[PDB]
Design a protein around this ligand. Structure first.
Ligand SMILES: [Mg+2]
Lengths: 1341, 50, 79
RNA sequence: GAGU
């Protein structure tokens, strides 16, 4: 028993690997991360919670009054989605927060015992996310695209070569906190360590520690290696560490207490070191020849007088050694700076730094940062400490802190907001190591080094921004009036909060128009991830670095999804199965392999973790639920790829398709297509427009069901059950007793979206698929969305394509098609354009909407009614007026000529400009729906009235029917509860439907069920009346519009969009083309069967561009249709079901090691015959990506479809009748009509509107602009000797007013001359130079 | 890389092979975008001199 | 000026107690002024946007690149 | 985004 819709149509799977775990909800990122922001979780510092506790409780300056945060609540959305679209508003919910104003006493110590006023204050309206993961902003759908960015924490970069002729290896540590200024520590070419606070200018790292309260000595301690040197009798002894002299050549004679070890001069090997080590050497007898050239630790004064003999960190000389030991101090502290492993780094910084105490260190901080400010101590202290250690300005976040902990290898993951002093020193520690060649560098592009910011996290960010400004204002008002009289509700403002929010959603680059051309584009677009936006890279900011492909993108981002040109490398698609951890690192699911054996355990790993373990490829061969086929298997690890043994093998790829995103996964023969074209293929799919007659892809991937279902453009069954009533408007289903709850009613409601307009003008119409009284279960596809078939993505349509040259019609990827395409209406698309007219009031006069139009044909007037409104459903053409509007005309002094004229005919010319909204040039069709926006004050026009009454009609119908059919299922169950114990049908049926208030029998757990449904009727009377009231209130109520705006009329106009020559079309393989000619059916070459061809693509557009997958698709496409038409033939000849069953089952089991074993037999005759009908016009097959149908399986299929094995057939020319000299490749390819329509891209312009300043034509057919003749274009002309062409471009055709006007006149009269002048652009320029105070002028000749 | 690709487009390449090819692909396409702008700049320079 | 000031101060209150926005009628009630005066003040209210303003989210057009000049009549109309 |  398969599900009932699958019985209606299954598509065959050629995949050899069985994918174990399921298809996740693809747009989970969006849903789940938005849910983060709302999350009512108590301890979880997320969204509202996190921001509130960060700000709250906010105590007054005085320390007496405080505002405390209790809990919040979200009002249920005030106005619905469709209304927001219609009225141009943003869809938002009210936020209120329980605050408690709490007043402590001055007098009583900390007597929290003064006043508590507790209440809910209003904080404004917050944009809500739609069900599909989208947003409603100013009347339009946008999506917030997830964002890549470099994570806060610590980066250690290398300057490879760079500056210098040397190529000096200059390492640097970059510290990025979530909130706060940044620290830079980089190496001078001279090996000196420089800091840049806030990356401004370089100074010594040492002085930072000075500010931190550290003196020179403590510094030298925590970095370099201590070595104790004792002075006794007359000889020098050191406290010696064994491992210190390793790898050094020899000067003096080491003795170890007794015996000699080391030859004087000869390079010591490792063995001599252990000998001496185990000999318990506490004090080796060193000559003082060594110490000539070392360096000192601390500041040694002479206790007896206290004069400064020698200072810290100085060069070592003979004479002062004597004076020193005479001060009675016979225990000093040399430094270990031997180059190589521990080079003179920090010491060198110290030397160049002339700055001294904590004081001049603080002042030097302050000087660089604020040049020209006095060294007031308070300024210095306050600056430095508040720079890095301040709670409100500096926050690493859990994110920053945890990743910082990873660079340093710190014990606990948990972090406090501020940088601890110890953190700082650690940085520099690792720095030194690296400089030696001890440590390794961090890769800028590592996956673990970039985090992904989903909507929840970014929302939280900008809400915290609104809250920061709120804090300045609120804390200021907390000292405002008296502590007694004021209220917190009056003091707390929404403005900056809601302003910051609407700026994030509306104005951010991350909040962008989604592509809704097809469900694919939507789905994909939402899960695209950009490295751009706030806190991220710009276009100029991007070099080779980030644009190039990291191997770690494997299984996480699809490597081939991305816009070409400027955006390439920036924006990529999330690959299928990858998802975010709590911290916003991408994880990919992998199969555990426990020492050789492959378990069913799924482990999600981050990038850095992935690098560690050895993973087998998805294609690698496995043995029956146990071990591997291959002794040496194909594996990846440490970023690298090669052959490895079973024993080290820790994991394995979950499935083949895990590499790639959504778009690319649909491409069946992807393995045979080059990436250049693969890329473009995924892109093109997004631009495909659905035709009214959506067809399922016959050449698929099995993928096509999951895509469609998740897009949510179709209608799906929540509970399933049996379909009780189906309408092309609503589908009502009676749920099965299993899933049905007994208290509520079990009638499920699906309102259907019919012929609705998308953002890109594309149609979204949902048609019902299943039949009335059919059983379906949960998650079956009821109604198809636009580009969807019975659950399948039906982006396009599949046609008969012959690869072959035509008489130059298929030239350079040009495309040749049959008249039959038009004939069948395939690739005809419905487009809705929405057009508005505004009635405003200037001080020049209130504009009115009326049918009153001076001096127009009554022919045009005819389509208008009394109010000036088109009759709904009229078919309109270019030039025709939809909506009448009249405007007060200004003053015009008519030439005496016109006064004369006007007097003569006396035509009633009143000062009124025709404002009425005209129909588009070159676009026509039927109006569906017109809408009215009545302002409140002035009453509605007759049309406004009538239309709002039509709203009434509809509204009322719907609610009534909703109520009544609910009862039918309710009273149906109560009769099914009444017939059990005491079987009394007849009497009940005839006894009146409304009188069943009186009925009642025995009491137990069943009268418990009677009163339940019984109090369901009593709440429907009350609830339904409030329902009716709600709807009544919002239609009549005065629409809050833009100030100055009296009224509006938006109008939806339908467009019937025919494919024509110059339209854009493509297949799934990136092969594209413009249509050059539609040939009559007679021209079309034809088969042996007499079947004429549909489309001719040029074969020569294939091999060098390297998409072989389309050829494979061709052949598979033919094979599919072969099975389908053989089924049709046996169906027309009746025959018997058994034979059909036998053939078709053997067909399913055709594939080599095909997974899908459908031993059919048990299926009932209805299901079988129904299914055969659907596959009458071709079996839908699935070659899944990288594990689909290889070449062998394809050829086998063609023979059982009675085909020549090559899939090339001999073809007859419809023109001449002659056979072609060799066989040609034909078959079905699934193709599409793209969003680019030559209809729009035609732009005609002779003359029209000019720009204000330069007086050049504006741009684009948008405002009837002229095309720009640019620098380059100029150059063409200049290449030739054409002076006057030039001059036309430069003068008469651009900014020369005199020239174009008088030349127009002369052209009309039959002249054709120039009559030259001066470009006004240049006049512009001259005077602009003169405003700069520069003399520019014409020298008279 | 030392290990080359054994298969051909007719045979169909595998996980690893296809992934390995993408690097070069992408580098090529990015090359286009950047390089023609530098070329264009150059050419305008030439033009403006002569 | 003074009147503008009054407006916005009351606006907050009204927005917070209504739940959403004050319609011109409702605002005018609390001000003790005439509705058309309030409506015309709202109209006069909004200040000029820069001519160089990047209207294109991509620094594509600076408002001026949309600008039509009503003073210049077409050569067609000159004829 | 499209294309050169
Ligand atoms: Mg081509």
């Amino acid at each position: 028993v398969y599900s009932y819709t699958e019985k209606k149509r299954i598509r065959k799977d050629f995949g050899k690997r069985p994918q174990v775990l399921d298809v996740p909800y693809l747009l989970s990122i969006q849903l789940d991360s938005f849910q983060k922001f709302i999350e009512q979780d108590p301890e979880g510092q997320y969204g509202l919670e996190a921001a509130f506790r960060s700000v709250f409780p906010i105590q007054s300056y005085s320390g007496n009054s405080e505002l405390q945060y209790v809990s919040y609540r979200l009002g249920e959305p005030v106005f619905d989605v469709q209304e927001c679209q219609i009225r141009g508003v943003t869809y938002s919910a009210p936020l209120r927060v329980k605050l408690r104003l709490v007043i402590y006493e001055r007098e009583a110590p900390e007597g929290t015992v003064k006043d508590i006023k507790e209440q809910e204050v209003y904080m404004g309206e917050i944009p809500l996310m739609t069900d599909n993961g989208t947003f409603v902003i100013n009347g339009t759908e946008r999506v917030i695209v997830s964002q890549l960015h470099r994570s806060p924490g610590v980066f250690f970069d290398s300057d490879k070569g760079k500056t210098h002729s040397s190529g000096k290896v200059l390492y640097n540590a970059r510290i990025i906190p979530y909130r706060g200024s940044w620290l830079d520590f980089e190496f001078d070419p001279k090996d000196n360590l420089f800091v840049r606070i806030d990356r401004r200018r370089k100074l010594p790292a040492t002085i930072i520690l000075r500010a931190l309260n550290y003196t020179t000595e403590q510094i030298l301690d925590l970095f370099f290696e201590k070595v104790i040197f004792e002075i006794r009798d007359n000889k020098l002894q050191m406290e010696l560490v064994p491992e210190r002299l390793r790898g050094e050549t020899a000067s003096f004679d080491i003795e170890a207490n007794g015996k000699v070890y080391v030859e004087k001069g000869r390079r010591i090997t490792a063995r001599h070191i252990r000998q001496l080590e185990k000999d318990d050497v506490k004090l080796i007898e060193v000559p003082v020849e060594y110490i000539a050239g070392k360096v000192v630790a601390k500041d040694y004064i002479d206790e007896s007088t206290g004069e400064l003999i020698c200072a810290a960190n100085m060069e070592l000389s003979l004479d002062l050694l004597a004076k020193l030991s005479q001060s009675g101090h016979k225990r000093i502290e040399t430094l270990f700076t031997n180059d190589l492993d521990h080079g003179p780094y920090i010491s060198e910084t110290l030397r160049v730094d002339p700055t001294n105490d904590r004081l001049s260190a603080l002042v030097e901080i302050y000087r660089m940062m604020r040049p020209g400010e006095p060294p007031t101590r308070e300024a210095a202290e306050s600056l430095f400490e508040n720079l890095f250690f301040s709670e409100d300005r500096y926050d690493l976040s859990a994110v920053g802190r945890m990743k910082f902990n990873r660079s340093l290898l710190r014990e606990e993951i948990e972090g406090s907001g501020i940088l601890s002093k110890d953190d700082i020193i650690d940085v520099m520690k690792k720095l030194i190591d690296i400089r030696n060649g001890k440590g390794e560098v961090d890769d800028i592009d590592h996956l673990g080094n970039r985090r992904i910011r989903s909507v929840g996290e970014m929302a939280e960010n900008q809400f915290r921004v609104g809250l920061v400004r709120v804090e300045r204002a609120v804390k200021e008002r907390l000292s405002l009036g008296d502590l007694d009289t004021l209220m917190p509700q009056d003091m707390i403002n929404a403005k900056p909060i809601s302003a910051a929010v609407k700026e994030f959603f509306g104005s951010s680059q991350l909040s962008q128009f989604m592509d809704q051309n097809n469900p694919l584009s939507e789905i994909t677009h939402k899960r695209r991830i950009s490295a751009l936006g706030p806190g991220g890279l710009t276009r100029e900011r991007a070099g080779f670095e980030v644009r190039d492909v990291h191997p770690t993108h494997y299984g996480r981002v699809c490597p081939i999804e991305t816009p070409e040109g400027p955006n390439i490398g920036l924006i990529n698609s999330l690959s299928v199965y990858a998802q975010t951890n709590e911290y916003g690192f991408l994880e990919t699911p992998y199969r555990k392999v426990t020492d050789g054996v492959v378990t069913d355990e799924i482990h999600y790993l981050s990038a850095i973790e992935e690098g560690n373990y050895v993973i087998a490829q998805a294609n690698s061969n496995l043995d029956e639920e146990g071990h591997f086929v291959e002794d040496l298997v194909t594996c990846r690890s440490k970023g690298e790829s090669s052959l490895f043994s079973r024993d080290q093998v820790d994991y394995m790829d979950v499935s083949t398709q895990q590499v790639v995103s959504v778009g690319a996964s649909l491409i069946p023969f992807l393995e045979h297509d080059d990436a250049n074209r693969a890329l473009m293929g995924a892109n093109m799919q997004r631009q495909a427009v659905p035709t009214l007659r959506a067809d399922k892809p016959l050449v698929g991937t099995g993928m096509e069901r999951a895509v469609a279902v998740d897009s949510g453009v179709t209608a799906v069954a929540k509970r399933g059950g049996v379909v009780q009533y189906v309408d092309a408007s609503r589908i009502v289903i009676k749920v099965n007793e299993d899933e049905m709850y007994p208290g509520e009613a079990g009638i499920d409601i699906y309102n259907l979206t019919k012929y609705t307009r998308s953002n890109q003008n594309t149609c979204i119409n949902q048609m019902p698929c299943v039949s009335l009284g059919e059983p379906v279960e949960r998650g079956d596809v009821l109604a198809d969305g636009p580009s969807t078939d019975l659950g399948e993505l039906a982006l396009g349509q599949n046609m008969r394509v012959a690869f072959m040259p035509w008489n130059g019609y298929n030239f350079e990827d040009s495309i040749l098609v049959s008249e039959r395409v038009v004939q069948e209406d395939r690739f005809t698309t419905i487009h809705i354009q929405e057009l508005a007219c505004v009635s405003r009031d200037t001080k020049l006069g209130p504009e009115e909407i009326t049918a009153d139009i001076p001096n127009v044909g009554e022919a045009a007037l005819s389509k208008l009614d009394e109010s000036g409104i088109v009759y709904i459903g009229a078919e309109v053409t270019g030039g025709d007026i939809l909506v009448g509007k009249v405007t007060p005309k200004g003053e015009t002094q008519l030439t005496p000529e016109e006064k004369l004229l006007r007097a003569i005919f006396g035509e009633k010319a009143s000062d009124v400009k025709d404002s009425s909204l005209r129909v588009p040039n070159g676009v026509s069709g039927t109006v569906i729906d017109v809408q009215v926006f009545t302002r409140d004050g002035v009453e509605k026009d007759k049309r406004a009235l009538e239309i709002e009454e039509m709203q009434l009609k509809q509204a009322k119908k719907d609610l009534s029917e909703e109520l009544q059919i609910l009862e039918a299922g309710l009273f149906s169950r109560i009769r099914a509860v009444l017939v059990a114990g005491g079987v009394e049908a007849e009497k009940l049926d005839k006894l009146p439907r409304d009188r069943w208030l009186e009925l009642g029998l025995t009491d137990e757990e069943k009268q418990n069920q009677l009163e339940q449904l019984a109090e369901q009727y009593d709440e429907l009377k009350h609830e339904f009346e409030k329902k009716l009231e709600a709807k009544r209130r919002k239609i009549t109520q005065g629409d809050d519009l833009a100030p100055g705006v009296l009224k509006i009329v938006k109008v939806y106009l339908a467009v019937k969009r025919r494919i024509q020559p110059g339209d854009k079309m493509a297949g799934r393989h990136g092969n594209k083309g413009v249509i050059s000619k539609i040939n009559p059916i007679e021209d079309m070459p034809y088969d042996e069967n007499g079947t004429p061809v549909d489309i001719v693509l040029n074969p020569l557009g294939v091999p060098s561009r390297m998409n072989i997958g389309q050829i494979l698709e061709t052949h598979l496409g033919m094979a599919a249709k072969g099975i389908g038409d053989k089924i049709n033939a046996m169906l027309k000849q009746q025959q018997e079901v058994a034979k059909l069953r036998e053939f078709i089952q053997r067909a399913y089991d055709l594939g080599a090691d095909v997974r899908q074993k459908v031993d059919l037999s048990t299926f009932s005759d209805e299901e079988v015959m129904r299914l055969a009908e659907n596959l009458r016009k071709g079996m839908p097959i699935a070659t899944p990506v990288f594990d689909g149908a290889k070449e062998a399986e394809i050829k086998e299929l063609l023979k059982l479809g009675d085909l020549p094995t090559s899939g090339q057939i001999r073809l007859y020319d419809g023109r001449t009748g002659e056979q072609f000299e060799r066989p040609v490749t034909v078959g079905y390819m699934y193709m599409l009509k793209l969003n680019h329509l030559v209809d729009d891209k035609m732009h005609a312009r002779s003359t029209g509107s000019y720009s204000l300043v330069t007086q050049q034509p504006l741009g684009g057919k948008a405002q009837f602009g002229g095309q720009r003749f640019g620098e380059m274009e100029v150059w063409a002309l200049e290449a030739y000797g054409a002076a006057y062409t030039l001059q036309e471009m430069l003068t008469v055709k651009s900014d020369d007013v005199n020239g174009r006007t008088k030349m127009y006149k002369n052209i009309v009269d039959g002249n054709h001359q120039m009559e030259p002048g001066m470009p006004e652009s240049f006049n512009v320029l001259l005077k602009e130079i003169r405003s700069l105070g520069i003399n520019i002028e014409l020298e008279d000749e | 890389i030392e290990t080359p690709i054994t298969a051909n487009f007719r045979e169909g390449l595998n996980v690893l092979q296809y992934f390995i090819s993408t690097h070069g692909a992408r580098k090529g396409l990015a090359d286009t975008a950047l390089k023609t702008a530098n070329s264009g700049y150059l050419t305008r320079r030439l033009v403006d001199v002569a | 000026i003074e009147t503008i000031n009054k407006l916005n101060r009351i606006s907050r209150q009204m927005l917070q107690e209504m739940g959403r926005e004050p319609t011109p009628e409702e605002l005018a009630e609390r001000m003790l002024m005439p509705e058309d005066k309030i409506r015309k003040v709202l109209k006069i209210a909004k200040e000029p946007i820069s001519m160089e303003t990047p209207i294109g989210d991509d620094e594509d057009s600076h408002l001026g690149d949309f600008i039509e000049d009503t003073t210049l009549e077409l050569p067609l109309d000159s004829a």
